[PDB]
Design a protein around this motif. Structure first.
Motif, short mmCIF file in Angstrom:
data_model
loop_
_atom_site.label_atom_id
_atom_site.label_comp_id
_atom_site.label_asym_id
_atom_site.label_seq_id
_atom_site.Cartn_x
_atom_site.Cartn_y
_atom_site.Cartn_z
N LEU C 92 0.81 -1.21 0.00
CA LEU C 92 0.00 0.00 0.00
C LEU C 92 0.85 1.26 0.00
CD1 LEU C 92 -2.89 -0.88 2.44
CD2 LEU C 92 -2.88 -1.03 0.00
N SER C 93 1.92 1.30 0.78
CA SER C 93 2.76 2.48 0.85
C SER C 93 3.32 2.87 -0.49
CB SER C 93 3.95 2.25 1.76
OG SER C 93 3.49 2.08 3.07
N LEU C 96 -0.64 2.96 -3.26
CA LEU C 96 -1.47 4.14 -3.17
C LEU C 96 -0.66 5.43 -3.31
CD1 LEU C 96 -3.94 3.06 -0.36
CD2 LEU C 96 -4.13 2.70 -2.78
N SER C 97 0.60 5.48 -2.87
CA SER C 97 1.41 6.66 -3.16
C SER C 97 1.69 6.81 -4.64
CB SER C 97 2.74 6.62 -2.45
OG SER C 97 2.50 6.54 -1.07
N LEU C 99 -0.52 5.78 -6.89
CA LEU C 99 -1.80 6.34 -7.31
C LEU C 99 -1.82 7.86 -7.14
CD1 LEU C 99 -4.65 6.00 -8.40
CD2 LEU C 99 -5.39 5.40 -6.11
N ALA C 100 -1.39 8.36 -5.99
CA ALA C 100 -1.28 9.80 -5.77
C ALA C 100 -0.35 10.44 -6.79
CB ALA C 100 -0.77 10.05 -4.35
N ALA C 101 0.85 9.91 -6.97
CA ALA C 101 1.80 10.48 -7.91
C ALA C 101 1.27 10.44 -9.34
CB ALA C 101 3.09 9.68 -7.80
N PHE C 103 -1.89 10.56 -10.29
CA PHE C 103 -2.86 11.65 -10.38
C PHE C 103 -2.16 12.97 -10.69
CE2 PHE C 103 -5.10 15.13 -8.09
CZ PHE C 103 -6.31 15.15 -8.80
N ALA C 133 5.76 15.80 -8.67
CA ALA C 133 4.72 14.78 -8.71
C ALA C 133 5.31 13.37 -8.59
CB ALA C 133 3.93 14.94 -10.01
N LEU C 136 6.50 11.32 -5.33
CA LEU C 136 5.53 10.68 -4.45
C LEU C 136 5.51 9.17 -4.65
CD1 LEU C 136 5.05 13.56 -3.85
CD2 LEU C 136 2.76 13.33 -4.66
N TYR C 139 8.94 8.14 -2.74
CA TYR C 139 8.79 8.08 -1.30
C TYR C 139 8.00 6.83 -0.89
CZ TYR C 139 10.05 13.18 -1.33
OH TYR C 139 10.62 14.39 -1.49
N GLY C 140 6.95 6.50 -1.63
CA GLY C 140 6.22 5.26 -1.44
C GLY C 140 7.07 4.02 -1.65
N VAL C 143 9.51 3.83 1.67
CA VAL C 143 8.80 3.25 2.80
C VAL C 143 8.55 1.77 2.56
CG1 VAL C 143 6.68 3.32 4.16
CG2 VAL C 143 7.72 5.42 3.43
N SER H 15 1.75 3.10 6.60
CA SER H 15 1.06 3.29 5.34
C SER H 15 0.29 4.60 5.33
CB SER H 15 0.13 2.13 5.08
OG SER H 15 -0.52 2.33 3.85
N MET H 18 2.42 7.76 4.99
CA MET H 18 2.90 7.94 3.64
C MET H 18 1.75 8.29 2.71
SD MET H 18 5.54 8.12 1.81
CE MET H 18 4.84 9.33 0.68
N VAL H 19 0.77 7.41 2.60
CA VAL H 19 -0.25 7.45 1.57
C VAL H 19 -1.02 8.73 1.64
CG1 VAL H 19 -2.36 6.39 0.75
CG2 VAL H 19 -0.36 4.99 1.30
N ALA H 22 1.11 11.62 0.61
CA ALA H 22 1.30 11.65 -0.83
C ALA H 22 0.03 12.11 -1.53
CB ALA H 22 1.74 10.29 -1.33
N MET H 23 -1.16 11.69 -1.10
CA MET H 23 -2.41 12.20 -1.65
C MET H 23 -2.52 13.71 -1.51
SD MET H 23 -4.14 9.74 -2.96
CE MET H 23 -4.25 7.93 -2.88
N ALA H 26 0.09 15.28 -3.82
CA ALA H 26 -0.35 15.10 -5.19
C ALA H 26 -1.41 16.11 -5.54
CB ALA H 26 -0.90 13.70 -5.40
N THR H 29 0.11 19.54 -5.67
CA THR H 29 0.91 19.64 -6.89
C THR H 29 0.06 19.70 -8.14
OG1 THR H 29 2.75 18.50 -5.90
CG2 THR H 29 2.74 18.54 -8.24
N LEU H 65 6.66 10.68 4.69
CA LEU H 65 7.83 9.82 4.64
C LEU H 65 8.48 9.70 6.00
CD1 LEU H 65 9.92 8.18 3.04
CD2 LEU H 65 11.05 10.31 2.54
#
Lengths: 97, 371, 150, 77, 84, 203, 150, 150
Positions: C92-93, C96-97, C99-101, C103, C133, C136, C139-140, C143, H15, H18-19, H22-23, H26, H29, H65
């Motif tokens: 997930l770390s 989903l990070s 996923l954020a990046a 986006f 962007a 992210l 960093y994910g 971790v 998680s 981080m997540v 990052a959201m 993101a 950004t 992070l």
């Protein structure tokens, strides 16, 4: 030396008009110089050589016209050799004719 | 016609004031070719009824000139990919000559397959060998134009990709049989001790712990062939490629700050060295040096007969940067390491105010004094 | 001894690392690929230069792959459950990070490309914003490396 | 015997390329580029191989092998 | 045919031969990494290595035969690239 | 908007609970609860059967209702400017009624195969009885939902034919082929539902 | 030894490999095949060149099929619960990565084809961006092959 | 002894740190990066000053992070359930606060960049507005540092 950006030199020159065309052409044959724009007002009717360029613009259209006719006729353009510029003397008028 | 149009268009960039007899003109030239243009001017007059040689004066009240670099087949694409991000300041250090190696190198470090190295080499060779033919051909196929215009850069990276791919001992997850091996044949496991595992192997998977006497000894080539066939191979291969990429990165960043010093020297800027380079390289070096040092120390100080309960590299680096070691868990590697961890971080933290604020302050005093 | 379900959370680690990263990189590629297509119309010159966000979005798939492979090759029947939770946390770390990046790369790549059509000087700014962007995902990854090897 | 001899071989090979190579470069505009090429190649390629061999020294664990491979390593080597 | 197909057949001929002969060699030296490519069976572990060695010969022949088809593709394509 | 955000709000809140509950019963070592074996035994076979029968009618009728109003509202609308519409296009309604007919055929069959047990323990109820219950459910659900879809399809393409016929009289005869392919879906939803029922017996 | 319910997760893997890649390839074909149709009215010549998004959408369903068959051949009446989860992981990891790739192929295909109709130079960029989309299915396939064979 | 599930809330802590950071980074950004790109046409000179919201969005991912790493460093199989709840609380505390700070940085950045191009005076204000967004990531961090060390 190429490990860094090359040392340039800005220069100013007193170009005699009768030499000018020849000098420009030789400099463009050398291909190792950049001219500064010294005419911020330059435009289609403000440019000092309106007619001379406009003649070239039309002679190029005349070339394109006769070339299109030749290519439609499929007559072979010979494409031989490589060539110098016209003289500075008015011989461009005989070419225009 | 086309030359004539261009000539008069260039003449239209010149100036003629209302009284003016000659044409005033100005140029940027390479300092090395000031003579070459003066010769072209004299020849231009000699191709004319004129006697006036139209000679220049060198200018002193100058704005920053346009930036030029000479280029050729083996160097032009490398200059272009540098120029494509931005054009260097006048007299500035040029990335392109260092880039001629380092861009292919980074490519090949990533693109680490021996067989793809060959195929890339062959592709670019066929463009270079056919070059004199291809230069006459169509350009309207833009892909073909691009790859051909890249032929020299592509060949170099292809060759280096053979080199990296060979050291990684891999094409298509296949070895080359050129190297020897540190891997042990089944008879070496049959020595009374562990002989039962050679029978278990008829029915179940097994792991060699690389123990002395059983192990085939320290390895002198690149990557050992055996990891191509081994099921756990990715753990080993990752430990290498991770740590390697980290080390290379530190090295390339340390080269870039080193180039900064030489650039600031050529521009003669004491402030940029004193408030920039010095605190910056100290910041970077104190943080980065320990990491690389400790990576090398693990590779020397630990081995199969000490592998269980060996410390994590990454954990000690994090706990350095955060001061956060709980006096427990993973073992410390060497005498006084805690003192070093504290010292190097504090030394890097002491660099920050020089970069952040002290330059702006001395600049403010200099501008207030320069009145 | 160790619970029978334990490897399920380690599998969801590997799966999430690849799946959510592929969703992130897909969004990044879809939005930026749209921006490139719309920009190309009056800009034949910029089409190749503009691929930057698209290829950068691909990196998030690879960070997802790295963690997914790193987890997947570390699975076993005997897995201590604690190791499976570390592997979920990791998967997930990154996932989903990423996923954020993705986006951020999608939105920035689209806008940055169109703005570069209007003003070619933006090309540098686009690269810089896409780095903020793309990190992210990185960093994910960090971790997830730490967790998947704690 | 030691791994240090292979190291010194590769070290010396790249050291000659990064020093004596430059000292054999001709005179002309390409000189600085060619010197940089030789030097930067020796530096990075030496380091790349050096780090690869250093990580190969002192293996903490050996290969895991499939049932079939554990039989064939009786004969194929 | 056309020149496009002939140019494809030239490149495919070159890379196909180069790789398949290297495999034919690696099979004929009985190299340990190659096991996963060999179509062995549970009976091929009986008696000794003779069964697996016969398979290394058969599989090496598959690659030499396939490289022969790439040589034939080569000769054909080196004619067609000149003829078209 | 509003009811879609309510259906989504309930739907997300439900699955947000179910992810958490499924994690909780795994990690707390509670796989002795979440006993799907308990749910599928103590839920009476008559419930699965009668949801199956009820959905076999009602979903078929829901599909035939959309079938009717989608074609019908176009028949009426075209019919104002083209009175010829109001007879020939009725065949599309007949195929929507046929989708309901397929419902009732199948649901009468399944209904007229149900019978009482006289037992209440999963061992005494036994596999035959459970398999009747679940089969009558899946069969009744399969004819119901297959007719639901088939009827909406024949509706849609019946408006298809009607709005086209309103502009050219010849088109209806050729367009009618799509209504046949639409109608076959409901018939497939019968054939399989017969097969899913065909081997059951309660007692 | 092993729960009778154990194969349920491994079956959901085989199913989900095919299901979510079919959805991905369907959307990839639907979105791009809408664009191809809209384009073809203006540029009848570009039809055969414009099929490629649809071909790559087909390939995502092939990655689904690959894992779905690989898992369905691997399943057995007593499968160890570990391997059943590894198979669920393989199924989701190709399947939803296939979905993501299919979304990217869809969006990029539609935008790319319409943009190509207005600018034939886009075709080169469109293919490159489509490979950066379609490879997300292939990265999902990598992890799914690893998990299903681990 | 400590329940074997106790690490789950710890890794969900790491998680979530981080997540959700990052959201936030993101979104911060993506909105500001749209603002920069859409601004660039009218005021090309403002790109290098306008990166500041983007940088502050990047910083929020660094807060996540840091906490995700601190949590990870503190995990062990034998962890007492008390410490794992602290790590979840720390994780959500930085992670969702960074989501909030990132939401603010996104909205402020997009408005702030587009405003600044029409009127340069806004800059002196919008940097202070952005400070009052970014400090939410700092408070989330401060709480998460306290919690993850009780």
């Amino acid at each position: 030396e190429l490990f860094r950006s090359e040392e340039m030199t800005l220069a100013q020159l007193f170009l005699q008009s009768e030499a000018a065309y020849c000098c420009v052409s030789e400099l463009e044959e050398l291909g190792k110089v950049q001219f500064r724009d010294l005419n911020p007002d330059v435009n289609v009717f403000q440019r000092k050589f309106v007619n001379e360029v406009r003649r070239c613009e039309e002679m190029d259209r005349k070339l394109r016209f006769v070339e299109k006719e030749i290519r439609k006729a499929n007559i072979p353009i010979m494409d031989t050799g490589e060539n110098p510029e016209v003289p500075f003397p008015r011989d461009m008028i005989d070419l225009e004719a | 016609v086309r030359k004539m149009k261009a000539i008069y268009h260039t003449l239209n960039l010149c100036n003629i004031d209302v009284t003016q007899k000659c044409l005033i003109a100005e140029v940027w030239c390479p300092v090395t070719d000031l003579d070459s243009i003066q010769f072209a001017l004299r020849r231009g007059t000699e191709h004319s009824g004129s006697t006036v040689p139209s000679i220049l004066n060198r200018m002193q009240t100058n704005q920053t000139p346009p930036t030029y670099n000479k280029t050729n087949k083996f160097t032009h694409g490398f200059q272009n990919i540098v120029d494509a991000y931005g054009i260097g300041t006048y007299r500035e250090i040029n990335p392109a000559p260092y880039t001629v190696i380092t861009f292919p190198f980074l490519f090949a470090v990533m693109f680490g397959d021996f067989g793809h190295g060959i195929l890339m080499t062959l592709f670019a060779v066929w463009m270079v060998l056919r070059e004199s033919r291809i230069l006459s051909q169509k350009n309207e196929n833009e892909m073909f134009s691009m790859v051909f215009s890249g032929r020299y850069i592509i060949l170099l990276m292809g060759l280096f990709s053979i080199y990296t791919g060979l050291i990684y001992n891999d094409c298509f997850s296949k070895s080359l049989n050129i190297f020897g091996s540190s891997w042990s044949v089944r008879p070496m496991f049959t020595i009374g001790n562990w002989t039962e595992e050679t029978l278990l192997g008829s029915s179940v998977l097994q792991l060699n712990p690389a123990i002395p006497g059983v192990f085939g000894g320290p390895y002198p080539f690149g990557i050992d062939p055996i990891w191509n066939i081994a099921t756990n191979k990715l753990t080993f291969l990752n430990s290498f490629k991770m740590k390697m990429s980290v080390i290379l990165g530190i090295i390339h960043m340390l080269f870039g700050v080193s180039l900064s010093l030489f650039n600031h020297i050529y521009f003669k800027k004491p402030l940029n060295i004193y408030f920039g380079f010095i605190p910056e390289i100290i910041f970077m070096s104190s943080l980065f040096g320990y990491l690389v040092i400790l990576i090398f120390y693990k590779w020397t100080a630990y081995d199969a007969h000490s592998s269980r309960n060996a410390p994590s590299l990454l954990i000690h680096f994090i706990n350095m940067f955060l001061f956060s070691y709980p006096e427990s868990g993973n073992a410390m590697l060497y005498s006084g390491q805690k003192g070093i961890q504290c010292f190097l971080i504090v030394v890097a933290m002491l660099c920050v105010p020089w970069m952040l604020l002290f330059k702006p302050l001395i600049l403010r005093h200099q501008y207030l004094r320069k009145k | 001894n160790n619970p029978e379900y334990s490897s399920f959370f380690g599998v969801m680690g590997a799966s999430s690392a690849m799946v959510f990263s592929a969703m992130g990189a897909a969004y990044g590629t879809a939005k930026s690929g749209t921006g490139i297509a719309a920009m190309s119309v009056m800009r034949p010159e910029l089409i190749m230069k503009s691929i930057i966000p698209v290829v950068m979005a691909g990196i998030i798939a690879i960070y997802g792959l790295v963690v997914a492979v790193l987890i997947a090759n570390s699975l076993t029947d005997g897995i201590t459950l604690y190791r499976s939770f570390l592997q979920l946390g990791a998967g997930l770390s990154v996932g989903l990070s990423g996923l954020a990046a993705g986006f951020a790369i999608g939105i920035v790549g689209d806008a940055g490309v169109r703005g570069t059509a209007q003003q070619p000087r933006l090309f540098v700014g686009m690269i810089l914003i896409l780095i903020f962007a793309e990190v992210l995902g990185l960093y994910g990854l960090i971790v997830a490396l730490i967790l998947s090897t704690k | 015997h030691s791994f240090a001899l292979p190291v010194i071989i590769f070290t010396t090979f790249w050291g000659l390329i990064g020093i004596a190579g430059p000292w054999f470069v001709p005179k002309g505009p390409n000189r600085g580029v060619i010197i940089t090429m030789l030097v930067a190649t020796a530096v990075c390629c030496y380091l790349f191989w050096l780090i690869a061999i250093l990580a190969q020294l002192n293996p903490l664990f050996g290969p895991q092998l499939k049932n079939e491979t554990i039989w064939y390593v009786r004969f194929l080597w | 045919c056309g020149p496009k197909l002939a140019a494809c057949g030239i490149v495919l001929s070159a890379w196909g031969v180069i790789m398949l002969i290297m495999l034919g060699i690696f099979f004929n030296v009985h190299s340990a990494v190659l096991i996963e490519d060999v179509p062995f069976t549970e009976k091929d572990f009986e008696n000794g290595p003779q069964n697996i060695y016969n398979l290394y010969e058969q599989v090496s022949y598959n690659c030499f035969i396939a490289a022969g088809l790439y040589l034939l593709l080569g000769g054909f394509s080196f004619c067609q690239v000149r003829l078209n | 908007t509003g009811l879609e955000l309510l259906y989504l709000g309930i739907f997300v809140a439900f699955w947000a609970c179910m992810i958490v509950v499924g994690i909780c019963y795994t990690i707390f070592d509670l796989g002795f609860r979440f006993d799907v074996a308990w749910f599928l035994t103590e839920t009476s076979p008559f419930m699965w059967s009668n949801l199956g029968i009820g959905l076999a009618i009602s979903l078929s009728v829901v599909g035939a209702a959309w079938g009717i109003y989608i074609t019908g509202s176009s028949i009426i609308g075209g019919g104002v400017k083209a009175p010829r519409i109001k007879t020939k296009n009725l065949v599309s309604i007949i195929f929507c009624e046929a989708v309901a007919i397929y419902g009732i055929i199948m649901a009468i069959v399944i209904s007229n195969m149900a019978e009482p047990f006289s037992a209440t323990d999963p061992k005494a109820i036994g596999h035959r009885n459970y398999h009747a219950g679940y089969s009558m459910f899946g069969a009744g659900l399969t004819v119901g939902l297959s007719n639901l879809f088939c009827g909406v399809c024949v509706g849609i393409v019946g408006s298809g034919a009607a709005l086209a016929d309103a502009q050219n009289p010849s088109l209806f005869v050729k367009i009618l082929i799509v209504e046949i392919f639409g109608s076959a879906i409901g018939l497939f939803g019968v054939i399989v539902a017969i097969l899913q029922t065909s081997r059951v017996k309660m007692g």
